[PDB]
A = this chain, B = another copy of it.
Amino acid sequence: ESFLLSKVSFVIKKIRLEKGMTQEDLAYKSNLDRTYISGIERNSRNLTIKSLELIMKGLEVSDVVFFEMLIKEILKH
């Protein structure tokens, strides 16, 4: 599938667990379905920037902070 997606997918989960959230909490605060949060983490779904933005707000994290961890995950071995 897509390189960037699974990275975006990975980072959303990583943060979520770092903050001791559950998918239920997250989909809560992101005002998306808990099915969608699952869908994203599970099968790296192809979300929209707007949806990503909602998730960032849900993770109680900033644009910047997210993208900084995104860059880190991309760079890894």
Chain A interface residues (CB < 8 Å from chain B): 2-5, 7-8, 46-50, 52-53, 63-64, 67-68, 70-71, 74-75
- What separation, in Å, do the CA atoms of A7 and B70 have in the docked complex? 17
Q: How many copies does the complex hold?
A: 4
- What separation, in Å, do the CA atoms of A5 and B49 have in the docked complex? 6
The secondary-structure label for the interface of chain A is helix
| Chain B, residue nearest A50 (CB) | B46
- B-chain residues with CB within 8 Å of residue A2 when the two chains form the complex: 49-50, 53
- What separation, in Å, do the CA atoms of A68 and B67 have in the docked complex? 8
Nearest Cβ distance between residue A55 and chain B, in whole angstroms?
11
- What separation, in Å, do the CA atoms of A46 and B64 have in the docked complex? 19
